[PDB]
Subunit: 362 residues, 3 copies
C-alpha cells in the first residue's frame, strides 16, 4: 500500500475541523447556556481535560483502540507510537494521520460530558473520571465498532459514531446528573459545531471519493430537515419558534445522520432529519437536556440506518446475505451493549472519584 | 470523464467555507449592526430560511438551475437528484460535490437579504418571499450565467457572481426597504466572511489549478486595496478612520473582485480594489446600506472585468474575435437584465405575501 | 517541474488557515486583554496594518525575501510579480500559491506587534514603524533563513519560524514597551490561533506528505503537554489553575514546537511542550507579557530543536557530517543574530516615527 496525497490532504484538513468542534465549538455552546458565575470555571475544565485526552491517546489510547487483540481490546505494541514507521500506510493515508483523526473523535466525546457537568463537579474529581471512562469505555467501544472487534464482526453499521460518540457520552452524562444568559454565544457555538461536523462525517470515508461526497450532501439535507421539524413542532405546541429551538433542531439532525450518512440516499436523509428533530423535541419535553438530544437522536439514527441502507430505498445496500430484519436486530443489540457498557463504567468512575477526593464542589 | 481526488478534496473544503459565510458569518455581521431588542428574532429568521433553501435546492432547485433546458430555465429531470448516479462526474469532480457547492451560493445570497430586513418583516411573510424569489429569480439568473443560458451564450464574464449573487440580492433588498450596538461582533462577522470568501472565489475554478491560485492571490490584493481606499477617503472627509469604515472597505473589495478574480492580473486587482472601496464610501454617503455596497460595488466590478481581462493589462485575455468594446457592451447588458429581472420578481413576492399574511410585523 | 494538484489544494487551504490567525484570531486575543475604552481603536489598527502588509508584500516584499541575491537580501526582479509566469512551479506547487502562503506569515508577525502596542502608540506612528521594520527586519531575516541566505547556508534548523516570526516580533515589541475585561473573548482568540496553527506548522512542509503528517501530530502533542505543564505550575505556586493560565500554556507549546515540529519525534514533542509551558510561566512571573512568552518560548524551542532532531532521540536526523554539538552552536548563533538585527531595526523605526509625527498618543 502506498499513500495517496489527495487523501492525505483531505484527512489532515478534516482532522483540524473536528478539533474546531471542541476548541471552541462545544465550549461556547455550553458557555451561553449555563449561569454566568460558572462560565470561567467550565471553560478551564474543558481546556485542561482536552489536553489530558490528547496525551493519553498518544501514550496508550490509540494502541488499545486500533491495535490487533481480541473482541474487546487491542494491544500495547504501539505505546507512544513505537514500531510505527513514519511512512507506514493505513488504508490510503499515512498512519500518523489516522492517529490524529481518531484522537480528535475521543476529544469531542469527552468535551460533550465535561461541558454539561462542570458546574456541579469538583476539578480533581472530573480528572479522575475522565481517566477511568476514556480507558475503560471509550477505548473498548471504539475497538468493538471500528477496530475489528465484536460489533464489526457481526456486521453493525455505524459510519461516524452514533454508538461510539453519541450514545456512549449521553449515558455517562445521565449517570452523573443522577448522582440561557447569552443566546448569541449559544448560536455561535452551534454554528462552529455544524461547520466542523463536515470533517467529522465526510472524513469518516477515509478518502476524497464518492462516499465522502454522499456523506457531505446527506449532512446538509438532514440538518436542514431537522431544523424545520423542530421549529414546526415548537410552533404547534408553544405558539411560535425560538432561537434555542432552531439551534437544538440543527444538533438533533446532525446526531441522527451521524451513523447513517455514508450508507443512505438523499430521500432517506430528509426522512431521518424530520424524525430526529421531532424526537429531540419530544425528548427534552419529557444543560443536561443535551444528553436527552444526543441519546434519543442517537438511538433513532442507529435504528433508521438498518432500514434506509436498503437498495430499494436509495441506499448503498446491505452486505451479501443480509436481510433488513437481520440488520435491524444487529443495530438493536449494538445499542443495548453500548448503553450497559458505558453505564457500568461511568458508575465506577464517579464512585472512585467520590471515595478519593469527593465528587461535589467544595 | 473520471473524477480527480485532489479536485474532490479542494471542492468539498471550499463548500464548507462558503456555508461558514452564512452560518455564522452574515448573522454575526447583521447582529452587531441592528438594535439589541431585535437580535434574537433576526438570528432565528436567518437560521430557518437557510434550512428552507437547503431543502428547496435538493427537491427542485439544482435541476432547474443546472439541467439542460432553454435560455431561461433548465428542467425537472433531476428532482430529489433522481437519475444522477453516485459516480457521475461534472467537470473534474463528482456531481454530488457540484450540487453541494452551488447550493451553498444560493444560501449566502438569501442570507444577505433576510439579515437586513428581519427587523421589519413578519416571519410568515419572509418565508413566502424566499420561496417566490429563489424559484423565480435566483434559479433563472444562475441558469442564464452558469447553466448555459442566455448570458453565457453571449459571452458574459462573471467568475464568482457579481450578477448572480451581489446585484441580484442588492436589488431585492432595496425593493423591500422601499415597500451599531456591538462593533466587536460586526468585526467578527466581517472576518468570518473574509476567510470563507476564499472558498467562494477560488472554488469557482472547479479544480486546484493555476486559475484557482490566481483567484486566491487577487482576493488578498483587492480586499487590502479597498480597506486602504475607504480609510483614506474617511480620513479626508470625516477627519479620521473608524472600525465600521475598515470593515465596510473589506466587504467593498471582496464584492468588487468577485466577477473579476479568475480573469485579471494582480495590477488589475489592486486598481479594482481601490476604486471599489471609494465607490462604496460614495454609495453609503448618498442596515440597508449593505445593499448600497453590494449593489454599487457589484456594478463597478462587472464593468471593470470587461476592461482588465485584456492581455495588454495583465489578464487572461478575451475570447477569440472579441474586442474590449464588445465585451464592455455585453457586461452592461448583463447588469441591466439582472436589475430588471430581480426587481420585478421581488415586487411580486413582497406583494403576494402582503395579500396573504400582511408584510409589516404585527 | 510540474505542479501536483493535491499539494496545490493542501497549500491553498493552509494559507486560508494562517490568514484566520490574524483576522480575527490575534485581534480577539488582544481584544479581551486590554482596557475596554481601547478595544475599538486597537481593532482598527490591526485591520489597517494587515491591509498595508498585504500590499507591500506583492509590490516588493516577496521579491526581496525570496528572489536570488546575496546572504542578506534578494532582488527587485519580481516587482508586482512581474516575470513570474502563471504556470511557474516552486517545489511541487504553483509559485502564486507560495507567494500567498509566505505573505500570510508576514501578516501574523506584524499582528503580534501591533495588537499589544496599539493602546500606547499614535496611528500615523504605527504606520511608519510597520513600513521600516517589515522592509529592513522581516524581509532580510526571512531571506537568511528560508531564502537561501546566511543562516540556511550554515545549516540552521527552523521548520516554521522560531526566529523569523516569534523571536523577531518579541524583540520589536520589547523595544517599543521600553520607549482582562473579557476572558471568554481571550479564550475564543486562543482557540482560533490554535486551529489556524495547523496550516502554519503542517503547511511549512510544502506538500501533503509524511513530514506534514509528523508536524501535525507533534503540534497536537506539544500544545497539550504545555497546557498541562503551565497549569501544574500555577497550582503549585498560586494554589489553583486559571482560564488565562490554560490559554497562555497553549500558546507557549505552540511557540515552542514551531521551529521543531517537522524534525522531532512524538517523545521529543512531549518534552519540548512541558519545558515550554514551565519556561513561559517563569517568564511572565519575572499585554506586553505576550512578548515574554513568544521570546522565552522561541529561544527554548530553537535550542531544543538542535537536540531532538537526533536519530537517537526519535528525530529525522542531522545532516551528513553534523554532530549534535555543531548543530547546537549554529542554533545559538542564529538566535543571537535575530535578536540584534530586530533590536537595531526596531529602534530606528520607532525613532524615525518620533521625529516625524511623535510616538505617544495625542
Amino acid at each position: 500500500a502506498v499513500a495517496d496525497k489527495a487523501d492525505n490532504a483531505f484527512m489532515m484538513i478534516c482532522t483540524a475541523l473536528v478539533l474546531f468542534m471542541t476548541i471552541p465549538g462545544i465550549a461556547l455552546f455550553y458557555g451561553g447556556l449555563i449561569r454566568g458565575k460558572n462560565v470561567l470555571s467550565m471553560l478551564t475544565q474543558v481546556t485542561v481535560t482536552f489536553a489530558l485526552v490528547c496525551i493519553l491517546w498518544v501514550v496508550y489510547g490509540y494502541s488499545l483502540a486500533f491495535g490487533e487483540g481480541n473482541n474487546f481490546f487491542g494491544n500495547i505494541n504501539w505505546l507512544m507510537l513505537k514500531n510505527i514507521e513514519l511512512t507506514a500506510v493505513m488504508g490510503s493515508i499515512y498512519q500518523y494521520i489516522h492517529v490524529a483523526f481518531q484522537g480528535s473523535f475521543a476529544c469531542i466525546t469527552v468535551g460533550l460530558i465535561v461541558g454539561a457537568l462542570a458546574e456541579r463537579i469538583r476539578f480533581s474529581a472530573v480528572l479522575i473520571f475522565v481517566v477511568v471512562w476514556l480507558t475503560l469505555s471509550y477505548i473498548p467501544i471504539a475497538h468493538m465498532v471500528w477496530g475489528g472487534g465484536l460489533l464489526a464482526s457481526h456486521g453493525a453499521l455505524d459510519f461516524a459514531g452514533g454508538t461510539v460518540v453519541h450514545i456512549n457520552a449521553a449515558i455517562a452524562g445521565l449517570v452523573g446528573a443522577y448522582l440561557p444568559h447569552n443566546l448569541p454565544m449559544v448560536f455561535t457555538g452551534t454554528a462552529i459545531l455544524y461547520i466542523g461536523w463536515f470533517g467529522f462525517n465526510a472524513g469518516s470515508a477515509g478518502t476524497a471519493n464518492e462516499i465522502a461526497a454522499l456523506a457531505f450532501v446527506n449532512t446538509v439535507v438532514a440538518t436542514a430537515a431537522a431544523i424545520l421539524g423542530w421549529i414546526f413542532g415548537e410552533w404547534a405546541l408553544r405558539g411560535k419558534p425560538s432561537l434555542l429551538g432552531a439551534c437544538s433542531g440543527a444538533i438533533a439532525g446532525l446526531v441522527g445522520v451521524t451513523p447513517a450518512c455514508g450508507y443512505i440516499g438523499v430521500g432517506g436523509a430528509l426522512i431521518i432529519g424530520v424524525v430526529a428533530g421531532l424526537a429531540g423535541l419530544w425528548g427534552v419535553t419529557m444543560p443536561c437536556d443535551v444528553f436527552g438530544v444526543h441519546g434519543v437522536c442517537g438511538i433513532v439514527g442507529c435504528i433508521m440506518t438498518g432500514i434506509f441502507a436498503a437498495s430499494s430505498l436509495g441506499g448503498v445496500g446491505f452486505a451479501e446475505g443480509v436481510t433488513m430484519g437481520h440488520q435491524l436486530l444487529v443495530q438493536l443489540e449494538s445499542i443495548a451493549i453500548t448503553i450497559v457498557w458505558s453505564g457500568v463504567v461511568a458508575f465506577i468512575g464517579y464512585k472512585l472519584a467520590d471515595l478519593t477526593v469527593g465528587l461535589r464542589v467544595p
